[PDB]
């Protein structure tokens, strides 16, 4: 079990760690989060009490280094930093553990939620979507735009998701216009899976990462990407059976975790009604259809 030490908490802030969250008061004696499960990526995220503008946060994997959070009063945000001195980091973590100044990652033993949401998410793939090579962790916030959004403006601060566009020469083979537009199997299997992602695990990893950035930061472009990656599969007549079964599991846990009161802004009615009721895969997503109909029957 790993630990992220806070130098201090000088401003009142709601802190998220994965799907959990807690409030810290201004100058409260808070020094970090312990007992973080090894084996998964994690996200530590922030919303300031005096300015809910800019949710922001950091994706990290404790296997890649020792990281900590330090409030920067000039840039006005909790910043993630790597500690290169392992003996110092162990020493700081131990004293704070002894003084009980840390919250414990509150994982219930029965509870596979975080694994189910991050099954295919790898830190190395995050670091290619979020380009800041000098750090082993990745910053994301509510306002960052995607490469695709910028094409339709600072490129260094962009989310480089894979561009999906159904009315593009990449998606449509000359001579197969009707075929490829009505059945996206070519675009899914040849262009995206074989060509760009190499395998379905990488495709699902990006899909899961997009959902998590949408949910945790309200990042609009991330929500667009998540829906586009769902629609691309659902609008293909030929999809490997193992991908359909895995997608149903992925989406089920995403819909289960979504806050009920954010459904209006995180779910696209057109995409979901098309995917569940009109698409080639309308009968392939049994678990997702069941939870959607029981939890969000209005949207449908």
């Amino acid at each position: 079990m790993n630990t992220v030490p806070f130098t201090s908490a000088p401003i009142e802030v709601t802190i998220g760690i994965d799907q959990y969250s807690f409030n810290v008061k201004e100058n409260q004696p808070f020094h970090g989060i312990k007992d973080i499960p090894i084996g998964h990526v994690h996200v530590i995220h922030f919303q300031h009490a005096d300015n809910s503008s800019m949710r922001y946060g950091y994706w990290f994997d404790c296997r890649m280094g020792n990281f900590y959070i330090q409030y920067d009063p000039k840039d006005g945000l909790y910043k993630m930093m790597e500690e290169r001195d392992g003996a110092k980091f162990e020493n700081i973590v131990h004293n704070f553990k002894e003084r009980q100044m840390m919250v414990s990652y509150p994982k219930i033993d029965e509870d596979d939620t975080w694994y189910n949401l991050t099954e295919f998410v790898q830190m190395d793939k995050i670091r290619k979507i979020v380009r800041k090579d000098e750090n082993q962790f990745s910053y994301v916030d509510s306002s960052m735009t995607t490469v695709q959004e910028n094409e339709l403006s600072d490129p260094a601060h962009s989310l480089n998701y894979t561009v999906i566009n159904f009315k593009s020469r990449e998606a449509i083979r000359p001579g197969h216009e009707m075929e490829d537009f009505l059945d996206k199997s070519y675009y899914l299997n040849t262009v995206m899976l074989q060509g760009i992602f190499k395998n379905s695990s990488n495709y699902f990893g990006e899909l899961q990462f997009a959902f998590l950035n949408a949910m945790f930061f309200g990042n609009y472009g991330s929500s667009l990407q998540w829906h586009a990656m769902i629609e691309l599969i659902c609008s293909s007549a030929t999809v490997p059976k193992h991908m359909l079964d895995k997608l149903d599991e992925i989406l089920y846990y995403q819909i289960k975790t979504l806050p009920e009161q954010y459904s209006d802004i995180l779910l696209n009615e057109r995409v979901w009604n098309i995917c569940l009721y009109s698409s080639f895969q309308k009968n392939s997503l049994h678990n997702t259809e069941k939870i959607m109909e029981n939890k969000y029957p209005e949207l449908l």
Binding site: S168, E177, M178, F181
Partner: protein, 237 residues
């Protein structure tokens, strides 16, 4: 974006544009079978592609053989229309290619956009005008060439005859839409109006009769009366 009454003079500017109407591409007669079921029999159709400034009409005849063994014909017809319009653009010299294609039915937007991806600078637009181009098959010389075709064929027409020698393209388009609207509303009476007087003939090289300027005014008034008469008959007014 969409084309409506606010930007109507745009149709007659110097930017090359074409209307595409697909309403006569897939045509059928519906009938009973020996067993008392219902079946369709296709008949030859056509794509109506018109330059409203010049009157140039590219009439692509759609022969019934293109439907043989195909499914979902109403859907396929939109994609075949888009394919043929795309082929038409690629065949035209660069300086003749349109800068905009206006489709009369919104269901043609995606098929045509997808077929024209290679032409990102040609705008594909809908229109809020209700244009009566479905009635093109009421023009006897157009109906004749479509029905006689034994294979796919492109037939080239000027739908304004020689009118642009005497009137503007705005006025010619208004005359055309009035004639077609009348033929759509009451075909028999419209043809009666156009042919009643044997001394005014259709030249071998024309689609419509050789009316003088004053006779066109009379004809246009008779067409407006027909449309109004039929409106009163329809709604009991």
């Amino acid at each position: 974006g969409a084309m409506n009454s606010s930007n109507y003079a745009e149709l007659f500017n110097n930017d090359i544009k074409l209307f595409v109407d697909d309403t006569n591409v897939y045509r059928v007669t519906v009938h009973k079978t020996f067993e008392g079921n219902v079946a369709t029999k296709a008949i030859n159709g056509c794509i109506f592609t018109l330059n409203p400034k010049t009157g140039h009409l590219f009439l692509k005849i759609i022969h019934t053989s293109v439907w043989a063994g195909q499914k979902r014909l109403s859907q396929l017809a939109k994609w075949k229309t888009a394919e043929e319009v795309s082929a038409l653009v690629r065949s035209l010299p660069k300086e003749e290619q349109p800068k905009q294609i206006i489709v009369t039915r919104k269901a043609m937007l995606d098929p045509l956009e997808v077929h024209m991806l290679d032409f990102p600078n040609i705008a594909i637009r809908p229109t809020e005008l209700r244009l009566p181009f479905s009635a093109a098959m009421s023009i006897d010389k157009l109906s004749d060439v479509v029905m006689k075709a034994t294979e796919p064929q492109m037939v080239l027409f000027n739908i304004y005859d020689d009118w642009l020698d005497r009137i503007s393209s705005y006025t010619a388009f208004s005359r055309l839409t009035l004639l077609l609207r009348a033929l759509k509303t009451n075909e028999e009476s419209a043809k009666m109006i156009l042919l009643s007087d044997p001394t005014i003939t259709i030249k071998s090289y024309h689609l419509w009769p050789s009316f003088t300027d004053e006779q066109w005014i009379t004809i246009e008034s008779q067409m407006r009366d027909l449309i109004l008469t039929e409106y009163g008959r329809k709604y009991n007014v």
